[PDB]
Amino acid sequence: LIPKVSVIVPIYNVEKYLDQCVQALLAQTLSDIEIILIDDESPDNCPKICDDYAAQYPNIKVIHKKNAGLGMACNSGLDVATGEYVAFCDSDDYVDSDMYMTMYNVAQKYTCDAVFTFKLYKNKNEIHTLLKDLIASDPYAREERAIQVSAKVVLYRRNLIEKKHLRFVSERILPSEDLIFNVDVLANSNIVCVLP
Amino acid sequence: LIPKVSVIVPIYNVEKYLDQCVQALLAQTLSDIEIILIDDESPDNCPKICDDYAAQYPNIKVIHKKNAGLGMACNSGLDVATGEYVAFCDSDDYVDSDMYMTMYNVAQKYTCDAVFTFKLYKNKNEIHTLLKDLIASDPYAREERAIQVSAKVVLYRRNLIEKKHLRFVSERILPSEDLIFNVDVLANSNIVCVLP
């Protein structure tokens, strides 16, 4: 009925990586995956490659936009996403087929609001403490947290994002847009897990 | 004898803008400026442009490096800077003739550890209050604070950076590298001011 995970892929001049990427998402072990391709006015052949996929498969949604950046692209993806969970995958990244299964199962077991990249944070208080490292004096602890919090592979409970109206800030305004979005999620969550 | 301000210029494929950039730096009203050109193994003719400038002016230092990125390039500049204050200048920016004078004076008057982008944060406690918005619930306050903290032009009290050996993380490892470095500085400062 409702997709288990919506995977949004922001696309811009990656025609040499796209196929392997979408094909890795199509090979996932987890069922009911909704794949969303956002063509941010890609100069190469990605626009047709997206149509080809949307035509050859039933779980692939596509949107062709006038160029506006990856952050805004991910947002368009979120607007059409319908899965219980949502995630972002870079064009130049072909993921391991057991990946989403692993993250989904974990998130379902502990009712997570987000699963990063073993530690479980049961309340916003424990999460808050995790975030304090970003603004305390110690550089290394801040570097460590920023790195962790900026992990590329993250699974978010979609309704937390919608309820909180969380969206990416354009990278053209904030180059650290991905980190900020992740903090938006963490500072507004209750339960969070971090995988090895 | 020691320079007032050290301007670090990370260089890569900017042959067409380098002259105007260095010249804008030479035309500054401030008297003791140390210009540090970090040739990040540029493919064009920037390496020779760099040698020609160091050979013509004694206050211009050049470092020919193996490619490693902008963050690492800034670190290389910090490794050799000697000015009382330091700043980073994008190769494609042609700066106003009195920009550094103005920030130097401002810095000297309130004994700032950093001058951004009128506000004056007198102590750690005030600066910390500022950093709190980056991790609190409200997405808007975090966005705005992150935007100002990510101001492109900032004058840093060099001794602060050296005493805490603050350094940039590679953009290749952490995209938010610029924001993180300014947070390192802020979280370790007494007195910080923002220019309107």
Q: H helices of A6-45, where?
A: 18-26
Q: Which residue has the tokens 């391709």?
A: A37
- A137: nearest CA in chain B? B187
| Joined tokens for residue B196 | 């309107």
B184 vs A contacts (CB less than 8 Å) = 139, 142
Q: B130 CA to chain A: closest CA distance, Å?
A: 10
The two three-digit tokens of residue A1, written as one number:
């009925």
- Give A-chain residues touching B176 at CB under 8 angstroms: 146, 150, 175-176, 178-180
Domains of chain A, earliest start first: 1-196 (3.90.550.10)
Pairing of strands B114-116, B33-39: unpaired
Strands of B114-116's sheet, edge to edge? B60-64, B33-39, B5-11, B85-88, B154-157, B114-116, B192-194, B119-121
CB contact at 8 A, A69 and A170: yes
Which residue in chain B is spatially nearest to A152 when comparing CA positions?
B174
Q: Taking a C-beta distance cutoff of 8 angstroms, is the pair B65, B42 a contact? A: no
CA distance B77 to B161: 12
Q: Residue A22 to residues A30, A101, B97: CA-CA distances in angstroms?
A: 15, 16, 51
SS3 A33: strand
Q: Among B154, B87, B143, which residue's Cα sits nearest to residue B117?
A: B154
How many whole angstroms separate alpha carbon B156 and alpha carbon B104?
A: 10
> In which region does residue A160 sit, left (phi positive, over 0), alpha (psi from -120 to 50) or beta (all else)?
alpha
Alpha carbon of B121: minimum distance to chain A alpha carbons (Å): 16
Is-contact B126 B48, C-beta < 8 A?
no
Q: Coil, strand, or helix at residue A103?
A: helix
Give me the residue label for tokens 């160091």: B54
Of B126, B84, B124, which is closest to residue B108 (Cα–Cα)?
B84
Q: For this experimental structure, what is the resolution in angstroms?
A: 2.3
- Find the largest Cα–Cα distance for chain B: 54
Measured at the alpha carbon of residue B29, what is the angle toward residues B24 and B30, in degrees to the nearest 5?
105
Distance of alpha carbon B137 from alpha carbon B175, whole angstroms: 23
Q: How far is Cα B94 from Cα B23, in angstroms, rounded to an integer? A: 8
How far apart are the C-alpha atoms of A161 and B20, rounded to whole Å?
46
Distance (Å) of CA B33 to CA B40, B87, B101: 21, 11, 10
Contact A150, A179 (CB under 8 A): yes
Residue B179: name the closest of A175, A28, A72 by CA: A175
Q: A-chain residues within 8 Å CB-CB of B179?
A: 174-176, 179
Interface A-B, measured as beta-carbon pairs within 8 A, has a size of 80
User: What gap in Å lies between CA B100 and CA B147, rounded to an integer?
Assistant: 22
Tell me if A180 and B143 make a contact (CB, 8 A cut-off): yes
Q: Which residues of B touch A143 (CB under 8 A)?
A: 169, 174, 180
CB-based burial of residue B110 (10 Å sphere; 0-12 exposed, 13-18 middle, 19+ buried)? middle
What span, in angstroms and rounded, lies between the C-alpha atoms of A27 and A35?
Answer: 12
Nearest alpha-carbon partner for A49 in A17, A19, A5: A19
Residues 6+ apart with CB under 8 A from A149: A116, A134, A179, A182, A183, A186
Which residues are CB-contacts of B133 (< 8 A; sequence separation ≥ 6)? B141, B142, B144, B145
Cβ distance B105 to A156 under 8 Å?
no
Q: Which residues of B touch A146 (CB under 8 A)?
A: 169, 174, 176, 180
Relative orientation angle of helices A177-186 and B139-149, to the nearest 10 degrees? 150
Distance between A175 CA and the closest CA of chain B, angstroms: 6
Structure tokens at A34: 């909704």
Q: Cβ(A185)–Cβ(A121) under 8 Å?
A: no
CA distance B35 to B24: 11
Q: What is the 3-state secondary structure (H, E, C) of chain B?
A: CCCCEEEEEEECCCHHHHHHHHHHHHCCCCCCEEEEEEECCCCCCHHHHHHHHHHHCCCEEEEECCCCCHHHHHHHHHHHCCCCEEEECCCCCCCCCCHHHHHHHHHHHHCCCEEECCEEECCHHHHHHHHHHHCCCCHHHHHHHHHHHCCCCEEEEHHHHHHCCCCCCCCCCCCCHHHHHHHHHHHCCCCEEECC
Determine the Cα–Cα distance for residues B4 and B85; give it in Å rounded to an integer. 6
Do A17 and A97 contact (CB within 8 A), yes or no? no
Measured CB to CB, residues of chain A less than 8 Å from chain B are 128, 131-132, 134-137, 139, 142-143, 146-147, 150, 164-166, 169, 173-176, 178-180, 183-184, 187-188
How many residues are listed for chain A in this entry?
196
| Minimum Cα–Cα distance from A130: chain B residue | B135
Which approach determined this entry? X-ray
